[PDB]
Design an enzyme around this catalytic site. Structure first.
Site, PDB file in Angstrom:
ATOM      1  N   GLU A   1       0.710  -1.172   0.153  1.00 50.25           N
ATOM      2  CA  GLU A   1      -0.471  -0.479   0.253  1.00 50.25           C
ATOM      3  C   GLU A   1       0.835   0.920  -0.283  1.00 50.25           C
ATOM      4  O   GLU A   1       0.669   2.937  -0.505  1.00 50.25           O
ATOM      5  CB  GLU A   1      -0.738  -0.155   0.690  1.00 50.25           C
ATOM      6  CG  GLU A   1      -1.852  -0.894   1.053  1.00 50.25           C
ATOM      7  CD  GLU A   1      -1.127  -2.102   2.456  1.00 50.25           C
ATOM      8  OE1 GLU A   1      -0.438  -2.762   1.929  1.00 50.25           O
ATOM      9  OE2 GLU A   1      -1.687  -2.322   3.465  1.00 50.25           O
TER      10      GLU A   1
ATOM     11  N   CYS B   1       0.026   1.796   7.288  1.00 49.93           N
ATOM     12  CA  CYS B   1      -0.165   1.438   6.227  1.00 49.93           C
ATOM     13  C   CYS B   1      -2.404   2.168   6.047  1.00 49.93           C
ATOM     14  O   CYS B   1      -2.772   3.206   5.640  1.00 49.93           O
ATOM     15  CB  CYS B   1      -0.659   0.461   5.225  1.00 49.93           C
ATOM     16  SG  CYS B   1       1.048   0.253   4.880  1.00 49.93           S
TER      17      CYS B   1
END
Ligand SMILES: Nc1ccn([C@H]2C[C@H](O)[C@@H](COP(=O)(O)OP(=O)(O)OP(=O)(O)O)O2)c(=O)n1
Ligand SMILES: Nc1ccn([C@H]2C[C@H](O)[C@@H](COP(=O)(O)OP(=O)(O)OP(=O)(O)O)O2)c(=O)n1
Ligand SMILES: Nc1ccn([C@H]2C[C@H](O)[C@@H](COP(=O)(O)OP(=O)(O)OP(=O)(O)O)O2)c(=O)n1
Ligand SMILES: Nc1ccn([C@H]2C[C@H](O)[C@@H](COP(=O)(O)OP(=O)(O)OP(=O)(O)O)O2)c(=O)n1
Ligand SMILES: Nc1ccn([C@H]2C[C@H](O)[C@@H](COP(=O)(O)OP(=O)(O)OP(=O)(O)O)O2)c(=O)n1
Ligand SMILES: Nc1ccn([C@H]2C[C@H](O)[C@@H](COP(=O)(O)OP(=O)(O)OP(=O)(O)O)O2)c(=O)n1
Ligand SMILES: O=C1N[C@H](O)C=CN1[C@H]1C[C@H](O)[C@H](COP(=O)(O)O)O1
Ligand SMILES: O=C1N[C@H](O)C=CN1[C@H]1C[C@H](O)[C@H](COP(=O)(O)O)O1
Ligand SMILES: O=C1N[C@H](O)C=CN1[C@H]1C[C@H](O)[C@H](COP(=O)(O)O)O1
Ligand SMILES: O=C1N[C@H](O)C=CN1[C@H]1C[C@H](O)[C@H](COP(=O)(O)O)O1
Ligand SMILES: O=C1N[C@H](O)C=CN1[C@H]1C[C@H](O)[C@H](COP(=O)(O)O)O1
Ligand SMILES: O=C1N[C@H](O)C=CN1[C@H]1C[C@H](O)[C@H](COP(=O)(O)O)O1
Ligand SMILES: [Mg+2]
Ligand SMILES: [Mg+2]
Ligand SMILES: [Mg+2]
Ligand SMILES: [Mg+2]
Ligand SMILES: [Mg+2]
Ligand SMILES: [Mg+2]
Ligand SMILES: [Zn+2]
Ligand SMILES: [Zn+2]
Ligand SMILES: [Zn+2]
Ligand SMILES: [Zn+2]
Ligand SMILES: [Zn+2]
Ligand SMILES: [Zn+2]
Ligand SMILES: [Zn+2]
Ligand SMILES: [Zn+2]
Ligand SMILES: [Zn+2]
Ligand SMILES: [Zn+2]
Ligand SMILES: [Zn+2]
Ligand SMILES: [Zn+2]
Lengths: 146, 146, 147, 147, 146, 146
Positions: free
Chosen positions: B70, B99
């Site tokens: 991510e 993330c």
């Protein structure tokens, strides 16, 4: 582990899975420094009829209904304002003359394709003069999901 | 053909194929208005050692060597100057707290994931507070290549 | 006796830290490209969520996990707006944690200048070394603003 | 007692002014979009050319024409880099001259916050009024950095 | 056909046709690698009074009402987020000192102008120091339309 | 004083003056909020042969050598990374089907053209379905230079 070439060609084939013109399911992935920046498949103009629903629009032996996969990747760049200069493209099918001109003009420097689809000798002439590398590469065998 | 959800979850899984940390092969695709704008897999910082070659760097039960999938998608945006605001993300694995914070802060509006990996309750708390849906969706069975 | 570039940007990082909402460390970061400021950040909760000042820290393994870090807030400004962070340097009040270090290096930040030697992670040093990024300690200059 | 946004950015504008190279007025400007800093500027000669500190002012009709103004340096950072200045506000140590006022208004700057009521041009006021842009006076807060 | 120089000087003159300050009808075209990226003419701030309607605002022998043509081209870049670095400009009139400073500061590398309007020696000094050529070039005779 | 419509159509005609395909001298000007952001004329791919020098490349009654004027404006956007979304275009000649698809896909919302050149009924069908306004407007009579 999938090489970069295999990684992106596989991605191009996956991208083609939403193609709405059954003459050729085409997918394209535009790449800059091994990063994906745009993708495209062949289908009607957004919010218009697709070949799947209303049939092909045939002219001189080509379906003219679709925005081509390569063109969809380039137009993603034009619409959003992302630079396509100094990129390479991975495409399931060798680019037609119109896509070839647009790609070369946009600063695409290398074209990797799977299927030798209706290769236009003038597209080859242009790639050659523009010094754009073109490379045939098979989509690798990849299974996704359980 | 593949729904948008299936199309992007399949892409996330394909993207994960280059992961270089065998604790979890993670892939992420960042999407704006159903266009792919960035992708990422988990691996060491570019031009540094990968877990595949030198082993994991373990701290408090996590491998800290890798830039997460991510984060790699978001950092592609930061590096290139691509706007990640008003996007959604498709990821093979539920995002960790780091993330999650970065995605929420960047303007990511929806998270779709396959594997319910190490769900952190604080990540859920923040997604909920920000009215960002976290949707579980299986990777579809897709076979690429001949 | 004008402020040097180094002093100018370290002063700025400290000023930027003045809105920090996590009292474990008031962190400020200024992202610079060719001696121009392109982004800044301080440590605080995710935008529109609770801050440590109001609800306390969220502690996990000896770290407050509530905050988006100062450096991350600078990088995320770039990702959210679409501003290129490639070929930049950063000035930060506190030495970057391992997560910030990875993100900075991955974004193309080429030099890191910091004031406080805060919880320096040996693996952060290892990565900066391998990636060939300089990490320079520089004191915040004494500067009086206002009045 | 944390610095308010107004105090935070006015403090920043004053800090930015610390590299000014024209002693007629040390001017600093900070361009802000949604409470993020996107550009800054101080008054000085064209980059890579002489500064007033070294060669003296270039006076014409009671103004030093040597310098690119602070506000202009912020806007030009945006033009040179390709950063959008539309829908921003600016914080500046000194009220903008007529040239800076025109450029700011034309660029889509929607609010101007200034400290010093410097040589306020009545036509600058007329334009801000017609264009419907607020011009708020705000003191630089007392802030001590370093040590 | 028209040389690049003639092509852009003609464009600058056409651009000047909407000028709303009759002291000098000024047009500017900003060019990067022979592509037009921005233009401008002299007129009041957008949505404010123009000299054509309310008269000039004179100070020290200059009309201060207008945003200058060159400044309008640069501010188009600032407003939209278009990079003006490594450009050249074609302008109907030699740039004043304010425009000169802004153009040089923005990374404009060459100035081509038609009318030798109110040349300021300090503007010449700065252009020379920055190794930016200032080239006089006549607008070509071009007739458009039927 | 030239209206905006006259201003931009005149610009499109001036832009066409560098056309290197004598089948039609085509110029295009892409406009966002009455600002010019890109232009194009019809000619060979950059750094390749032009029709003026080596002749047309005829296929099915069209010269396929050229990148079209409209396409050159859009590709300027793709190459540089400038957003073509929510623009209008002024063109000397009604767009062919390929240009029409690209323009519509890029987010061009209005098309103003001078010459009713080989109007493709399918281009009309697409503009209609996509709800893109098209308007015929004559190039005004304008003389430039002494
Ligand atoms: N990731 C994407 C999204 C869109 N397109 C292109 C392919 C078609 O030319 C058109 C489809 O866009 P729509 O807005 O019509 O999207 P739909 O959700 O209707 O998909 P479809 O028309 O394929 O059913 O845009 C593309 O190439 N890649
Ligand atoms: N399309 C891409 C390209 C890179 N990266 C991220 C994953 C790793 O964190 C790092 C890998 O970048 P390298 O420059 O090291 O690329 P290599 O060709 O060396 O690949 P690898 O290190 O995976 O072998 O960048 C990514 O997420 N997606
Ligand atoms: N110039 C800025 C603006 C914001 N942020 C970051 C710090 C926090 O992580 C978060 C704060 O954003 P909010 O939208 O919550 O802003 P507030 O005006 O509510 O500020 P605060 O929450 O600090 O009171 O964004 C930052 O680093 N720098
Ligand atoms: N962060 C910055 C950097 C530059 N400038 C402007 C102010 C001057 O008009 C010019 C200074 O640019 P130089 O390239 O000459 O930078 P120097 O490092 O030489 O600084 P100085 O000239 O101030 O010593 O640019 C600015 O406003 N803000
Ligand atoms: N293509 C353009 C459009 C605008 N401008 C500049 C010139 C004036 O300084 C101002 C005019 O913008 P308006 O928004 O006022 O546009 P109008 O349609 O009202 O035009 P005018 O005021 O010229 O009648 O913007 C410019 O230089 N070039
Ligand atoms: N302002 C511009 C510049 C270029 N082009 C397009 C038209 C042609 O398709 C191609 C011409 O580009 P070249 O790099 O070949 O430029 P030349 O200087 O060689 O011009 P020409 O080929 O027209 O002589 O690019 C354009 O539409 N508009
Ligand atoms: O998307 C691409 N890309 C390539 O450039 C060529 C064809 N196509 C599309 C166009 C049409 O839908 C198609 C089958 O092509 P023809 O209809 O031109 O044979 O595949
Ligand atoms: O890429 C992601 N994304 C998700 O946010 C979570 C973990 N990861 C990576 C990090 C490491 O390489 C990993 C296995 O995670 P842990 O080591 O934290 O359990 O998968
Ligand atoms: O903003 C940064 N940047 C640096 O990378 C390190 C910590 N921080 C923040 C995170 C938390 O709010 C903090 C105090 O750090 P720890 O809680 O990890 O010790 O300062
Ligand atoms: O930077 C700004 N911004 C404001 O718009 C006004 C003046 N200035 C600069 C210009 C010069 O160096 C200056 C002193 O102004 P005058 O010389 O015009 O009085 O401060
Ligand atoms: O647009 C430009 N560009 C050049 O830099 C010089 C003047 N101008 C404008 C300003 C005013 O409207 C004008 C006549 O200039 P003076 O009023 O400064 O003489 O032409
Ligand atoms: O530039 C455009 N734009 C329009 O879309 C149509 C044609 N053209 C060009 C293509 C060729 O050079 C041309 C004459 O068109 P035909 O060769 O397709 O009839 O003018
Ligand atoms: Mg559809
Ligand atoms: Mg590697
Ligand atoms: Mg808040
Ligand atoms: Mg200097
Ligand atoms: Mg007006
Ligand atoms: Mg040529
Ligand atoms: Zn079809
Ligand atoms: Zn094609
Ligand atoms: Zn690992
Ligand atoms: Zn993670
Ligand atoms: Zn805390
Ligand atoms: Zn950190
Ligand atoms: Zn001075
Ligand atoms: Zn000023
Ligand atoms: Zn006037
Ligand atoms: Zn001027
Ligand atoms: Zn031809
Ligand atoms: Zn066409």
């Amino acid at each position: 582990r999938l090489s970069w070439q295999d990684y992106f060609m596989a991605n191009a084939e996956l991208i083609s899975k939403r193609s709405t013109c059954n003459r050729a399911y085409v997918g394209a992935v535009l790449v800059k420094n091994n990063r994906i920046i745009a993708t495209g498949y062949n289908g009607g103009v957004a919010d218009t009829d697709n070949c799947d629903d209303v049939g092909h629009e045939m002219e001189d032996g080509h379906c003219i209904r679709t925005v081509h996969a390569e063109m969809n990747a380039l137009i993603q760049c034009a619409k959003e304002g992302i630079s396509a200069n100094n990129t390479e493209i991975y495409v399931t099918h060798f680019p037609c003359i119109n896509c070839t001109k647009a790609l070369l003009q946009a600063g695409v420097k290398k074209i990797t394709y799977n299927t030798a689809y209706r290769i236009h000798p003038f597209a080859i002439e242009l790639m050659t003069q523009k010094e754009v590398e073109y490379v045939q590469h098979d989509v690798p065998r990849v299974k996704l999901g359980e």
